[PDB]
Short mmCIF file of all heavy atoms in Angstrom, two decimals:
data_model
loop_
_atom_site.label_atom_id
_atom_site.label_comp_id
_atom_site.label_asym_id
_atom_site.label_seq_id
_atom_site.Cartn_x
_atom_site.Cartn_y
_atom_site.Cartn_z
N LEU A 163 8.56 2.70 2.15
CA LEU A 163 7.09 2.33 1.94
C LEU A 163 6.99 1.11 1.10
O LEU A 163 5.83 0.57 1.11
CB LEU A 163 6.39 3.55 1.37
CG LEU A 163 5.45 4.45 2.22
CD1 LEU A 163 5.46 4.02 3.67
CD2 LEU A 163 5.92 5.95 2.04
N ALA A 164 8.03 0.56 0.56
CA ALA A 164 7.98 -0.66 -0.33
C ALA A 164 7.46 -1.91 0.38
O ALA A 164 7.74 -2.06 1.65
CB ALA A 164 9.37 -0.92 -0.87
N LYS A 165 6.75 -2.64 -0.31
CA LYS A 165 6.04 -3.93 0.12
C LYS A 165 6.08 -5.05 -0.84
O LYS A 165 6.12 -4.87 -2.15
CB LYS A 165 4.65 -3.65 0.48
CG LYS A 165 4.33 -2.70 1.58
CD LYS A 165 4.65 -3.07 3.04
CE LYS A 165 4.72 -2.07 4.04
NZ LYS A 165 4.67 -2.55 5.50
N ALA A 166 6.05 -6.23 -0.42
CA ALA A 166 5.96 -7.45 -1.22
C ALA A 166 4.46 -7.60 -1.58
O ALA A 166 3.67 -7.63 -0.69
CB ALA A 166 6.41 -8.74 -0.55
N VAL A 167 4.09 -7.81 -2.89
CA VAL A 167 2.69 -8.01 -3.26
C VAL A 167 2.56 -9.46 -2.86
O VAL A 167 3.16 -10.38 -3.49
CB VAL A 167 2.35 -7.68 -4.70
CG1 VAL A 167 0.88 -8.17 -5.05
CG2 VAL A 167 2.51 -6.23 -4.97
N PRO A 168 1.56 -9.93 -1.96
CA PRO A 168 1.36 -11.26 -1.59
C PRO A 168 0.95 -12.26 -2.83
O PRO A 168 0.31 -11.83 -3.60
CB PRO A 168 0.11 -11.30 -0.64
CG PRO A 168 0.18 -9.92 -0.07
CD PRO A 168 0.57 -9.00 -1.21
N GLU A 169 1.68 -13.45 -2.79
CA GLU A 169 1.47 -14.51 -3.89
C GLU A 169 -0.05 -14.83 -3.94
O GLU A 169 -0.57 -15.24 -2.93
CB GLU A 169 2.37 -15.60 -3.65
CG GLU A 169 3.22 -16.08 -4.85
CD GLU A 169 4.37 -15.11 -5.16
OE1 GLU A 169 5.33 -15.15 -4.45
OE2 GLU A 169 4.35 -14.50 -6.25
N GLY A 170 -0.65 -14.78 -5.12
CA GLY A 170 -1.89 -15.18 -5.41
C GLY A 170 -2.95 -13.86 -5.19
O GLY A 170 -4.04 -14.07 -5.14
N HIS A 171 -2.32 -12.66 -4.94
CA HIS A 171 -3.06 -11.42 -4.83
C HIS A 171 -2.56 -10.38 -5.76
O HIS A 171 -1.41 -10.38 -6.24
CB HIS A 171 -2.86 -10.94 -3.33
CG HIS A 171 -3.44 -11.90 -2.28
ND1 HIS A 171 -2.75 -12.86 -1.70
CD2 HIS A 171 -4.68 -11.76 -1.81
CE1 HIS A 171 -3.51 -13.44 -0.86
NE2 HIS A 171 -4.82 -12.89 -0.83
N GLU A 172 -3.55 -9.41 -6.14
CA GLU A 172 -3.23 -8.49 -7.19
C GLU A 172 -2.79 -7.11 -6.50
O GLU A 172 -2.31 -6.28 -7.21
CB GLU A 172 -4.34 -8.26 -8.19
CG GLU A 172 -3.86 -8.34 -9.59
CD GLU A 172 -4.86 -8.35 -10.71
OE1 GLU A 172 -5.99 -7.95 -10.52
OE2 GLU A 172 -4.43 -8.79 -11.91
N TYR A 173 -2.99 -7.03 -5.18
CA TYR A 173 -2.64 -5.75 -4.45
C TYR A 173 -2.25 -5.95 -3.03
O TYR A 173 -2.30 -7.08 -2.47
CB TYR A 173 -3.91 -4.90 -4.47
CG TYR A 173 -5.14 -5.35 -3.70
CD1 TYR A 173 -5.28 -5.11 -2.35
CD2 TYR A 173 -6.16 -6.10 -4.39
CE1 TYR A 173 -6.27 -5.63 -1.68
CE2 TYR A 173 -7.17 -6.66 -3.62
CZ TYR A 173 -7.27 -6.44 -2.28
OH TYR A 173 -8.35 -6.86 -1.53
N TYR A 174 -1.77 -4.93 -2.43
CA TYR A 174 -1.33 -4.87 -0.99
C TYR A 174 -2.38 -4.06 -0.29
O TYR A 174 -2.61 -2.99 -0.78
CB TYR A 174 0.08 -4.37 -0.92
CG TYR A 174 0.47 -3.80 0.48
CD1 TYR A 174 0.80 -4.66 1.53
CD2 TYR A 174 0.28 -2.41 0.77
CE1 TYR A 174 1.10 -4.17 2.80
CE2 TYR A 174 0.62 -1.91 2.00
CZ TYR A 174 0.98 -2.78 3.06
OH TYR A 174 1.29 -2.43 4.31
N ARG A 175 -2.85 -4.57 0.84
CA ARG A 175 -3.80 -3.90 1.56
C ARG A 175 -3.06 -2.75 2.54
O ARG A 175 -2.26 -3.20 3.39
CB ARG A 175 -4.70 -4.79 2.47
CG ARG A 175 -5.47 -4.15 3.57
CD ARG A 175 -6.64 -5.11 4.21
NE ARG A 175 -6.13 -6.53 4.23
CZ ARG A 175 -6.44 -7.49 3.48
NH1 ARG A 175 -7.30 -7.26 2.45
NH2 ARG A 175 -6.07 -8.73 3.68
N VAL A 176 -3.31 -1.43 2.25
CA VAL A 176 -2.74 -0.39 2.97
C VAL A 176 -3.29 -0.12 4.35
O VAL A 176 -4.54 -0.08 4.47
CB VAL A 176 -2.22 0.82 2.08
CG1 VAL A 176 -2.47 0.59 0.55
CG2 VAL A 176 -2.89 2.09 2.57
N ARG A 177 -2.44 -0.10 5.31
CA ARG A 177 -2.77 0.21 6.76
C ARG A 177 -2.88 1.69 6.99
O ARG A 177 -1.94 2.15 7.79
CB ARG A 177 -1.83 -0.50 7.68
CG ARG A 177 -2.19 -1.91 8.14
CD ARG A 177 -0.97 -2.79 8.47
NE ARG A 177 -0.18 -2.22 9.53
CZ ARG A 177 1.06 -1.72 9.33
NH1 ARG A 177 1.67 -1.62 8.09
NH2 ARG A 177 1.83 -1.26 10.33
N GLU A 178 -3.84 2.41 6.32
CA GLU A 178 -3.99 3.81 6.54
C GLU A 178 -3.04 4.66 5.66
O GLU A 178 -1.91 4.22 5.45
CB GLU A 178 -3.96 4.34 8.06
CG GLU A 178 -5.07 5.22 8.39
CD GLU A 178 -6.42 4.75 8.07
OE1 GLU A 178 -7.08 3.84 8.68
OE2 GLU A 178 -7.04 5.47 7.15
N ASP A 179 -3.54 5.80 5.15
CA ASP A 179 -2.59 6.68 4.33
C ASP A 179 -1.60 7.55 5.20
O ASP A 179 -0.87 8.29 4.54
CB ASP A 179 -3.43 7.57 3.35
CG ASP A 179 -4.37 6.79 2.40
OD1 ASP A 179 -3.87 5.79 1.79
OD2 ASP A 179 -5.58 7.23 2.24
N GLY A 180 -1.73 7.37 6.42
CA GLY A 180 -0.91 8.03 7.43
C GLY A 180 0.26 9.03 7.03
O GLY A 180 0.00 10.19 6.60
N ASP A 181 1.58 8.60 7.02
CA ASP A 181 2.66 9.33 6.54
C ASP A 181 3.04 8.87 5.07
O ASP A 181 4.28 8.46 4.87
CB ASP A 181 3.79 9.20 7.43
CG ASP A 181 3.44 9.48 8.99
OD1 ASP A 181 2.29 9.98 9.23
OD2 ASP A 181 4.29 9.39 9.95
N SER A 182 2.12 9.05 4.15
CA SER A 182 2.38 8.68 2.69
C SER A 182 2.23 9.82 1.76
O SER A 182 1.52 10.75 1.98
CB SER A 182 1.45 7.55 2.29
OG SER A 182 1.67 6.44 3.15
N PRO A 183 2.95 9.78 0.52
CA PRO A 183 2.83 10.94 -0.40
C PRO A 183 1.51 10.76 -1.22
O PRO A 183 1.49 10.28 -2.30
CB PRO A 183 3.99 10.68 -1.29
CG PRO A 183 4.41 9.27 -1.30
CD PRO A 183 3.90 8.74 0.12
N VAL A 184 0.41 11.09 -0.56
CA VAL A 184 -1.03 11.06 -1.12
C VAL A 184 -1.21 11.80 -2.40
O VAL A 184 -1.96 11.34 -3.14
CB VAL A 184 -2.01 11.34 0.10
CG1 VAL A 184 -2.10 10.38 1.20
CG2 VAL A 184 -1.88 12.80 0.61
N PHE A 185 -0.44 12.88 -2.59
CA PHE A 185 -0.47 13.72 -3.83
C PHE A 185 0.23 12.99 -5.08
O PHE A 185 0.11 13.55 -6.19
CB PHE A 185 0.07 15.19 -3.57
CG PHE A 185 -1.00 15.89 -2.74
CD1 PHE A 185 -0.55 16.38 -1.50
CD2 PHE A 185 -2.31 16.28 -3.24
CE1 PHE A 185 -1.65 17.14 -0.72
CE2 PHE A 185 -3.15 17.05 -2.48
CZ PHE A 185 -2.84 17.44 -1.23
N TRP A 186 0.76 11.93 -4.85
CA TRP A 186 1.36 10.98 -5.89
C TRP A 186 0.62 9.66 -5.90
O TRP A 186 0.99 8.70 -6.62
CB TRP A 186 2.86 10.66 -5.46
CG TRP A 186 3.79 11.66 -5.89
CD1 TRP A 186 4.80 11.62 -6.94
CD2 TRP A 186 4.15 13.10 -5.17
NE1 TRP A 186 5.50 12.88 -7.01
CE2 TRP A 186 5.12 13.69 -5.89
CE3 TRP A 186 3.46 13.55 -4.00
CZ2 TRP A 186 5.53 14.91 -5.44
CZ3 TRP A 186 4.02 14.80 -3.69
CH2 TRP A 186 4.96 15.48 -4.26
#
C-alpha cells in the first residue's frame, strides 16, 4: 500500500478505501 508523497504536497490522494485496513 506504500506511496511517494508528491513533492510540494502534504498528502497522497487515495483511489478508494477498497482493499485497505480501514480499522487502522
Side-chain angles (χ1 to χ4, degrees):
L163 259 356
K165 299 285 168 169
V167 175
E169 229 75 70
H171 295 90
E172 227 171 26
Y173 66 87
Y174 159 82
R175 169 165 37 256
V176 354
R177 262 151 64 251
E178 228 50 72
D179 307 311
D181 309 352
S182 300
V184 295
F185 289 113
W186 277 257

